[PDB]
Ligand binder design. Structure first.
Ligand SMILES: *[C@@H]1O[C@H](CO)[C@@H](O[C@@H]2O[C@H](CO)[C@@H](O)[C@H](O)[C@@H]2O)[C@H](O)[C@H]1NC(C)=O
Ligand SMILES: *[C@@H]1O[C@H](CO)[C@@H](O)[C@H](O)[C@H]1NC(C)=O
Lengths: 48, 49
């Protein structure tokens, strides 16, 4: 029920705990030097 | 020496140690443990040094 201007899909395979590591305003070896999400992140993460 | 220990005492008698007059750089605790929960309350872990 939503309309979006632009939609971005960033894909990457990672460990299990790093899935919980991925969240806005987080920290970790991956969250600090590999992939940091915006503090005002408008979206979400899919992990299977 | 507090994360390199081998006999962390039981919860019924918890072992308390004091740290003073030194330089606290927390990259050592960051790389010395496969962290599962870092829920800090008083100070955010990020800019902790
Ligand atoms: C809690 O764990 C500490 C780990 O460093 C212990 O500190 C050491 O204790 C030894 C004696 O056991 C000292 O020789 C050493 O200098 C250092 O202080 C500490 O003793 C321990 N406390 C309890 C109550 O077990
Ligand atoms: C200190 O940590 C290292 C690496 O984690 C380990 O190999 C060593 O056995 C530890 N020392 C003691 C006394 O447990």
């Amino acid at each position: 029920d939503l309309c979006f201007t632009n939609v971005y899909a960033d894909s990457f395979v990672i460990k299990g705990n790093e899935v919980s590591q991925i969240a806005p305003g987080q920290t970790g070896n991956i969250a600090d030097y590999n992939y940091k999400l915006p503090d005002d992140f408008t979206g979400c993460v899919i992990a299977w | 020496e507090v994360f390199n220990a081998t006999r962390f005492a039981s919860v019924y008698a918890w072992n308390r140690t004091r740290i003073s007059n030194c330089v606290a750089d927390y990259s050592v605790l960051y790389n010395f443990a496969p962290f599962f929960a870092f829920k800090c309350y008083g100070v955010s872990p990020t800019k902790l040094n």
